[PDB]
């Protein structure tokens, strides 16, 4: 799916230029703020749900993140916790617990949630 | 009826609180099984229907004894756990 991200980001920039030149702005200082105004004026959909309105955005905000390749071309997996089926979770867990242990050997309402 | 009166099943209220002394006597009879016997003996209960009672009671007593023991044995490990979030 990564080839899709390369391609999409390329075409996104080419279409970005294409947008600026017709909309008649400097392609350099063009922002998302300007992207919105632009499409909103070109394809004016009265629609209540705002996700179903036209979008041109950087594919990263469009597409979901992906889980990277989890094993080498030998079949052998990179992370040692892979077989847990959640490596992402238990890595945080291993690290957290490690932090704790080290703290125990060493040691001898701001609106924050 | 041939025995001297007032020696049996008698509490004497202390510091004039009656309700307390009655609770006390009640605890006596119920500790010895006399209340369950009065209540048992209001009507009859036939011999078979009695061994059934006996056996159900005694099974149930065995179960509750064992389960009690097991609970009070595992009691220690109720203590807040050391290894959390390993
Ligand atoms: Mg008489
Ligand atoms: Mg009995």
Could you characterize what this model shows?
The structure is cut from a larger assembly and holds chains A (113 residues) and B (86 residues). Chain A is mainly alpha-helical. Chain A is 50% helix and 0% strand. Chain B has 86 residues and is mainly alpha-helical. In chain B, 58% of the residues lie in helices and 0% in strands. Classes of the chains: A mainly alpha (113), B mainly alpha (86). The structure holds magnesium ion (2 copies).
- By DSSP, the count of extended strands of chain B is 0
Largest sheet of chain A: none
The assigned structural class of chain B equals mainly alpha
Strand content of chain B: under 5%
Tell me the series of helices and strands of chain B, N- to C-terminal: HHH
Gap from first CA to last CA of chain A = 35 Å
Q: Strand percentage of chain A, roughly?
A: under 5%
What ligands does this structure carry?
A: magnesium ion
Q: What's the helical proportion of residues of chain B?
A: 55-70%
Radius of gyration of chain B: 22 Å
Share of helical residues of chain A: 40-55%
* Span of the ends, CA to CA of chain B: 74 Å
Q: Which oligomerization state do the chains in this entry correspond to?
A: part of a larger assembly
Largest β-sheet summary of chain B: none
**H-E string of chain A:** HHHH
Write down the Rg of chain A.
23 Å
Features:
part of a larger assembly, 2 chains, A: 113 residues, mainly alpha, 4 helices, B: 86 residues, 58% helix, binds magnesium ion, ribosome, translation, mitochondria, mammalian 55S mitoribosome
Task: Briefly summarize what is shown.
This is part of a larger assembly, with chains A (113 residues) and B (86 residues). Chain A has 113 residues and is mainly α.
Task: Summarize the SSE layout with pairings.
This is part of a larger assembly, with chains A (113 residues) and B (86 residues).
Chain A: H1 2-23, H2 32-42, H3 59-62, H4 87-106
Chain B: H1 18-32, H2 34-40, H3 47-74
The complex binds magnesium ion (MG) (2 copies).
